[PDB]
Amino acid sequence: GSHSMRYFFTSVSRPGRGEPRFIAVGYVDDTQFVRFDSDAASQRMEPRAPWIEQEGPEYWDGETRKVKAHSQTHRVDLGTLRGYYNQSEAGSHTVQRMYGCDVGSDWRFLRGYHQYAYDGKDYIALKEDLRSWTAADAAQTTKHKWEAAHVAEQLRAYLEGTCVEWLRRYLENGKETLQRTDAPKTHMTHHAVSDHEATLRCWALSFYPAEITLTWQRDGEDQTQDTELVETRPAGDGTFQKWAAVVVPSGQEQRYTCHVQHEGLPKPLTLRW
Amino acid sequence: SLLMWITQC
């Protein structure tokens, strides 16, 4: 239903090993569709999705110019934040920047983000109204400069009016990829821990999008209190994985059932082994 | 696409 377009920018400051490394990755939903690495072979924004390879060369020139502007501004940002926090030049520091827009079912603007972090902790971010900033102790001066430059309003213009339109263009271009919902493929794995206890695992393989719920039920209530669960792991082919395992007291497996909830499931599956 | 003009901190 809801879609989202995000850009993640990472600048890490090599104190004595060249100019800072810059990585910029764009995501629509869970699919990464563009990339840029300042240490890569080509200083060009490279496509990472098939449906965007058909964008015109002028599009790629624009993306490359804007990502180089981001890289230069992030270099100056590292230089400025080191001075703001009175840190020594020899230290290596990282700057992370994320912005993007969300879109509802009826394909309208739904939410707009622009967050900024220094050394992995929050520095400054745009509030949900796209008109004000949330700032840290030494990020107050950055907020003041950003309000003087009226960057909040340009950010609102980008997120609400052109981020949404570009997200819709990407959705229409990737109709067979982004708008798909790969249903989970599921297994139950039985392994023996001892003669009096065994582990029962509920697999969920190759599903898209990444959101999913695995709940174990003892012929009744949920069993999240003694369940082993892993994070949705990226399969690598564009889909995702997850499993959830409990311990059966060696013979009461039929009492245990895993419930997998997903958008691609017409009725949530209920495996029993 | 990306943001056009992003301001320095």
């Epitope: 002028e58 624009g62 009016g161 052109t162 339109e165 | 696409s1």
Partner: nanobody, 112 residues
Framework: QVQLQESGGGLVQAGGSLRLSCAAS????????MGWYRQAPGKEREFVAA???????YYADSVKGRFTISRDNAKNTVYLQMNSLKPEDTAVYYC???????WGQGTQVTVS
């Protein structure tokens, strides 16, 4: 290649009605979204206005209610009506097309 033949600036009197202009040539897909900026001498660049292909308008709080961003798809032109120019508005303006990542050449606006 693309180029922004922005013009229309100059010296205006306080409370004037200056009307900036900006057009693109060489690339026939720039009309997707275009915005205006400015940079007073000695000051950092500042957002002014932006307009999308459908005509949605966005302004900074300083220029809200007195400036006007306008576009016409047929002639590729984008304009900026500038009613009531306070003397704070003396700056070199920059028309930028968001699709191409390209900045204008800096039409100058000075107000007494």
């Amino acid at each position: 290649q693309v180029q922004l033949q922005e013009s229309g600036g100059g010296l205006v009197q306080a409370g004037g009605s200056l009307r900036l202009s900006c057009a693109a040539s060489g690339n026939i897909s720039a009309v997707y979204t275009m915005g205006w900026y400015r940079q007073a001498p000695g000051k950092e660049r500042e957002f002014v206005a932006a307009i999308d292909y459908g005509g949605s308008t966005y302004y900074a709080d300083s220029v809200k209610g007195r400036f006007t961003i306008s576009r016409d798809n047929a002639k590729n032109t984008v304009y900026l009506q500038m009613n009531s120019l306070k003397p704070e508005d003396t700056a070199v303006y920059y028309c930028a097309s968001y699709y191409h990542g390209y900045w204008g050449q800096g039409t100058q606006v000075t107000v007494s």
